[PDB]
Amino acid sequence: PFDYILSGGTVIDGTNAPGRLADVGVRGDRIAAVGDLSASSARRRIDVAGKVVSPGFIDSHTHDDNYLLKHRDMTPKISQGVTTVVTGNCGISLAPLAHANPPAPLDLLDEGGSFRFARFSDYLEALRAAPPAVNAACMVGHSTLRAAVMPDLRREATADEIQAMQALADDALASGAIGISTGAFYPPAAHASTEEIIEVCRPLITHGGVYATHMRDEGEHIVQALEETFRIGRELDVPVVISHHKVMGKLNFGRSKETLALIEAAMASQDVSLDAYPYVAGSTMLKQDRVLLAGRTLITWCKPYPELSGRDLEEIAAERGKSKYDVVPELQPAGAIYFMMDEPDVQRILAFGPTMIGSDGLPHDERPHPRLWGTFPRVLGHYSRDLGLFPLETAVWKMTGLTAAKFGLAERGQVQPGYYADLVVFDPATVADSATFEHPTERAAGIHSVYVNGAAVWEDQSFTGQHAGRVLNR
Ligand SMILES: [Cu+2]
Ligand SMILES: [Zn+2]
């Protein structure tokens, strides 16, 4: 007998095919059958009429490394239908690094002495010992490796430093990491050369991981950053994932046409993937950057002046008698939200075929960017349903089957007999992102229930207490 059958709903199986009326049977951690299951014995037959049953959403771009440990309920993500998270992005991973004051943007993961894992394997063991509510596919970050090896980060690494970083990367991958990420845009790695990055990432071909990247520049010099990324992919001969694709700054508005054309061409000759969040504002460490700071900027948290969280930087700057750019140093370390993208470009990038959905949520932020809480329903509701940017099955494919395939998460991302039971039950008519910039932590509407490895982790708008997630391997 099946443990339960979700009956009477519409299944969107994650293979980018129109939904069809069918029941979904689960036994243990597996989807046992799909179709008319009235003839199958089941201990429970849960009515989901008027709802869609789809694979659980896989967040391809998270900074949940530490959150998985400190808040195992993972409410920001399971309340949106997320069943799996990809961690250690943009060169930022929690492990391996024992440091009481890691350099920004590594502090985006810190809750105070959180960087305590000497080996990447120690981090994975901690997750397995006290599992979170969602599955975790973890990458090791190049900036974290630099911080752990180099005495001085403002320069290229020596051969000895590269050998040390490479060994850590290899141990991480051997322990289960699914890839290595870089973020040369940030201070910790702004001085790393392309050759340094290639050498540190050599273990990816041996272990079969992916190379993920927050490109060196996403504005005026984004073409060069794209070419650097494609070059790295060819040198290593491994898949590359371009993180949170965008064109930032008014002088680059509309350039997604040009960037998407370059990516499409590269995909014809080498393995390339990309993801994006559905908003016109980004968020990361507060930084002295003329383009990030050109438009509306909001403080998400501030170490030296905590009372600044939630304030407009222009106001803070003006009242201190300085430009936003000049006032940044005295407010650091801090985080911010930057309104530097244009809707037309965001829509173009989301609609581009291969683009996967990634929230880029910064979970420790005092006053976070709403993407932390609304990303997936914003795509399913606002964009698919209300704006008609793509049909519902394609919006679902972009957060399930496509993502599972690009990251090599076997037996997940599809409602198929034999696959793992990571599932979401949502009302297609009401699913919506409730989080706004003003109230960034509101729970999404229309998410009925979420299941991870067969266990319900979200029901009646609340975490069930089931710590059902698993550390995954590629
Ligand atoms: Cu990131
Ligand atoms: Zn990034």
Automatic annotation (TrEMBL):
Enzymatic class: hydrolase
UniProt keyword annotations, A-Z: Hydrolase, Metal-binding, Zinc
Molecular function GO terms recorded: hydrolase activity, acting on carbon-nitrogen (but not peptide) bonds, in cyclic amides; metal ion binding; N-acyl-D-amino-acid deacylase activity
This protein's record includes keyword Hydrolase: yes
Any one Gene Ontology cellular component term annotated for this protein: cytosol
Residues that coordinate or bind Zn(2+) 1: 61, 63, 90, 360
Binding residues annotated for Zn(2+) 7, in chain numbering: 315, 319
Binding site for Zn(2+) 2: 71, 111
Residues noted as binding Cu(2+) in the record, renumbered to the chain: 61, 63, 90, 360
One Pfam family named in its UniProt record: Amidohydro_3
Annotated residues for binding of Zn(2+) 4: 170, 207
Residues where Zn(2+) 8 binds: 382, 386
Binding site for Zn(2+) 6: 237
Ligand binding (Zn(2+) 3): 90, 214, 244
EC number(s) on file: 3.5.1.81
Binding site residues for Zn(2+) 9: 467
Domain Amidohydrolase: 46-326
Protein name: D-aminoacylase
Source organism per UniProt: Alcaligenes faecalis
